[PDB]
Scaffold this active site. Structure first.
Site, PDB file in Angstrom:
ATOM      1  N   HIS A  41       0.808  -1.282  -0.031  1.00 44.16           N
ATOM      2  CA  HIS A  41      -0.031  -0.014  -0.133  1.00 44.16           C
ATOM      3  C   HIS A  41       0.909   1.284   0.043  1.00 44.16           C
ATOM      4  O   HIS A  41       0.247   2.364  -0.185  1.00 44.16           O
ATOM      5  CB  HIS A  41      -0.986   0.014   0.879  1.00 44.16           C
ATOM      6  CG  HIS A  41      -0.538   0.284   2.477  1.00 44.16           C
ATOM      7  ND1 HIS A  41      -0.644  -0.788   3.409  1.00 44.16           N
ATOM      8  CD2 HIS A  41      -0.136   1.275   3.111  1.00 44.16           C
ATOM      9  CE1 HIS A  41       0.097  -0.178   4.390  1.00 44.16           C
ATOM     10  NE2 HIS A  41       0.152   1.178   4.461  1.00 44.16           N
ATOM     11  N   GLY A 143       2.128   5.822   9.681  1.00 42.36           N
ATOM     12  CA  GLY A 143       3.703   5.975   9.290  1.00 42.36           C
ATOM     13  C   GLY A 143       4.603   4.550  10.027  1.00 42.36           C
ATOM     14  O   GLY A 143       5.563   4.499   9.322  1.00 42.36           O
ATOM     15  N   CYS A 145       3.753   1.437   9.403  1.00 44.05           N
ATOM     16  CA  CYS A 145       3.354   0.543   8.504  1.00 44.05           C
ATOM     17  C   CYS A 145       5.052   0.044   7.926  1.00 44.05           C
ATOM     18  O   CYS A 145       6.010   0.957   7.773  1.00 44.05           O
ATOM     19  CB  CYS A 145       2.468   0.753   7.434  1.00 44.05           C
ATOM     20  SG  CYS A 145       0.897   1.017   7.877  1.00 44.05           S
TER      21      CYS A 145
HETATM   22  C1  LIG Z   1      -4.116   7.132   7.902  1.00 41.01           C
HETATM   23  C2  LIG Z   1      -4.235   5.964   6.818  1.00 41.01           C
HETATM   24  C3  LIG Z   1      -5.665   5.582   6.828  1.00 41.01           C
HETATM   25  C4  LIG Z   1      -5.850   4.309   6.026  1.00 41.01           C
HETATM   26  O1  LIG Z   1      -5.384   3.275   6.658  1.00 41.01           O
HETATM   27  C5  LIG Z   1      -5.151   2.155   6.015  1.00 41.01           C
HETATM   28  C6  LIG Z   1      -6.035   1.295   5.332  1.00 41.01           C
HETATM   29  C7  LIG Z   1      -5.466   0.013   4.933  1.00 41.01           C
HETATM   30  C8  LIG Z   1      -4.385  -0.153   4.949  1.00 41.01           C
HETATM   31 CL1  LIG Z   1      -3.813  -1.870   4.199  1.00 41.01          CL
HETATM   32  C9  LIG Z   1      -3.300   0.442   5.678  1.00 41.01           C
HETATM   33  C10 LIG Z   1      -3.998   1.642   5.857  1.00 41.01           C
HETATM   34  C11 LIG Z   1      -2.695   2.520   6.664  1.00 41.01           C
HETATM   35  C12 LIG Z   1      -2.973   2.315   8.208  1.00 41.01           C
HETATM   36  O2  LIG Z   1      -3.850   1.414   8.551  1.00 41.01           O
HETATM   37  N1  LIG Z   1      -2.027   2.926   9.040  1.00 41.01           N
HETATM   38  C13 LIG Z   1      -1.889   2.654  10.345  1.00 41.01           C
HETATM   39  C14 LIG Z   1      -1.413   1.575  10.847  1.00 41.01           C
HETATM   40  N2  LIG Z   1      -1.331   1.230  12.280  1.00 41.01           N
HETATM   41  C15 LIG Z   1      -1.809   2.241  13.049  1.00 41.01           C
HETATM   42  C16 LIG Z   1      -2.144   3.207  12.735  1.00 41.01           C
HETATM   43  C17 LIG Z   1      -2.558   3.802  11.293  1.00 41.01           C
HETATM   44  C18 LIG Z   1      -3.335   4.882  10.861  1.00 41.01           C
END
Ligand SMILES: CCCCOc1ccc(Cl)cc1CC(=O)Nc1cnccc1C
Ligand SMILES: CCCCOc1ccc(Cl)cc1CC(=O)Nc1cnccc1C
Lengths: 304, 304
Positions: A41, A143, A145
């Protein structure tokens, strides 16, 4: 003496972290030999995330669109490919800090350390378990990821997790290093059921043995149980059913303490039915399930 | 989202660990520049530990009696000196992996990461607090002496603790890197009172703010309190008295959440008086005091 939620020393993994940028998105990558692994992604914009056609999005990218920086130095990308939900960026330089490593797919209930990273830079390290429902209860922000989970056996790092996303419920989902999600999750911004989770019984029992080894013994009782009776209690309290395979894995702790596994099951049964009564075990007021029997033996014996 | 007991990435400290042997005793040393720091009790035999005359024991040792090994390579000792409870072994080679570092004396209630080591090899990393009574509740076995505690601000490691001993109660005592014990402890095998410990109020409040930031809000109430009233409750429950200096350090968390510090004090007062009622906060069934306000801001903002 003492028992802590101990993570593996993160140095061997810190040496592999890089920053990967594609367009406007920046996340972490893992540089091992001449390949950088990262969540696919990174090629999306926030708008693409509702339902990304990753194959189409990747077709618009060339090697020069993947900016990979290892601290202050830039890596030259000479190839890119998508494997499941990860991208593999071939670089022209093997990471000189590549440790001995393996890629493993962990089983639910097993534990591992996470080196949380932002912009390719390590922020912290913690230990956690892969829940029976294939989520992890981590600590991750936007950030993070591409941060990875791993275990270390002597000089070999076994990478088992790469962080991809936070579910709307605040729990975390990710993949093995071949890009296969743990659990039913997909890398899309959609409602995703995690499914019923359970408490990892074999780990709670291991932690009760850790408690006895370290002097917390108030929960020991005059009772015993059977696997069948204990599993009726486990069912009522949403604990994983205990099997003879779990009893066998608790053998070393049972031999060290002299407490038969089913006798420890009866202590656990009483704790489930009666609660802690305002008392603590190893500084916890709940039954801890993030230590495997192997973790307890390792911490109690000082394995390096 | 998510909140974990996160340790600093240990790589910069792993690169400093060495094994120190003197006679029959082996423990860990910290190699920074051309000096190796270790607990002075490496010069004792188990028999000497009841009341060691360290000055006399050290007079019997020469540079060649201190065997220092950094992984597979042997360091050449060209000087030795005792500073308080630490020995400083001057070596002929500066550690090439010496990070930017400082030696600091932490205050009670502050937190730090411990890289537990055995035979100069890292075993694990965990986060802990220096208790108000100057003990640490670590996880250490025989051979862990010389393992260090530290904090990291960007590229600078601030070493604050070196492990020396386990008290008969199973709690841990050690020194700053100038060899001064934290607390009243002496490096002898004698009965040593640790003294009354208290719960670190400012850290519990910081962790309640961490809980609100991450969505655990059930403990928020319609009440407020004053510093005087809250301190009457703190007294009854063996909590440190809250001061305006603590309120000021909670300013950033109060500004981020919009919850006034005394309103969070009233939530804490109700939790102290009523308990958790079988509920949890950030996966804990007790009030956690091992996160400082700075730790919460760092973890909640992703500082690397
Ligand atoms: C701000 C990103 C919104 C979309 O989120 C996403 C939708 C789908 C996918 Cl495969 C990845 C993401 C990014 C994601 O989840 N990031 C994240 C990870 N861990 C803890 C907090 C966060 C915000
Ligand atoms: C087996 C050593 C007995 C005497 O102990 C000692 C007496 C005095 C001093 Cl200044 C040091 C020590 C060694 C010590 O406490 N080691 C240790 C540390 N942490 C956790 C477990 C252990 C066993």
């Amino acid at each position: 003496s003492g028992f802590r939620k101990m993570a593996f020393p993160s140095g061997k993994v810190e040496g592999c972290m890089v920053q990967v940028t594609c367009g406007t998105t920046t996340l972490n990558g893992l540089w091992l030999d001449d390949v950088v692994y990262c969540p696919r992604h990174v090629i999306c914009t926030s708008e693409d995330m509702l339902n990304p056609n990753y194959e189409d999005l990747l077709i618009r990218k060339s090697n020069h669109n993947f900016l990979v920086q290892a601290g202050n130095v830039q890596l030259r990308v000479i190839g890119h490919s998508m494997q499941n939900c990860v991208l593999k960026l071939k670089v022209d330089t093997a990471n000189p800090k590549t440790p001995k490593y393996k890629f493993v797919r962990i089983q639910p209930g097993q534990t591992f350390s996470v080196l949380a990273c932002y912009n390719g830079s390590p922020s912290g390290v913690y230990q956690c378990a892969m829940r029976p429902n294939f989520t992890i209860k981590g600590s991750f922000l936007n950030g993070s990821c591409g941060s990875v989970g791993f275990n270390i056996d002597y000089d070999c790092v076994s990478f088992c997790y790469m962080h991809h996303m936070e579910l709307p419920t605040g729990v975390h989902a990710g993949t093995d290093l071949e890009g296969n999600f743990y659990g039913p999750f997909v890398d899309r911004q959609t409602a995703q059921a995690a499914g019923t989770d359970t408490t990892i019984t074999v780990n709670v029992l291991a932690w009760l043995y850790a408690a006895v080894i370290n002097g917390d013994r108030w929960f020991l009782n005059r009772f015993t149980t059977t696997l069948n009776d204990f599993n009726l209690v486990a069912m009522k309290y949403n604990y994983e059913p205990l099997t003879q395979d779990h009893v066998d894995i608790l053998g070393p702790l049972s031999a060290q303490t002299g407490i038969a596994v089913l006798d420890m099951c009866a202590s656990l049964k009483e704790l489930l039915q009666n609660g802690m009564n305002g008392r603590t075990i190893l500084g916890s007021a709940l039954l801890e399930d993030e230590f495997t029997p192997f973790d307890v033996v390792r911490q109690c014996s000082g394995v390096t």
